[PDB]
Amino acid sequence: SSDFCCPKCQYQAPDMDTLQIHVMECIE
Ligand SMILES: [Zn+2]
**Sequential DSSP letters for 1-28:** ---EE-BTBS-EESSHHHHHHHHHH---
Residues within 5 A (CB) of ion ligand 1: 6, 8-9, 11, 26
Residue 1: how many CA atoms within 13 Å on its side-chain side?
0
Ligand 1 center from residue 18 Cα (angstroms): 11
Q: Residue 5, annotated ligand binder?
A: no
Closest by Cα among 8, 11, 12, 13 to 28: 8
Q: Residue 9, annotated ligand binder?
A: yes
**Structure-determination technique:** NMR
Could you tell me the sign of the dihedral formed by the alpha carbons of 17, 19, 20, 21, in that order? positive
Ligand 1 center from residue 17 Cα (angstroms): 13
Q: Residue 26, annotated ligand binder?
A: yes
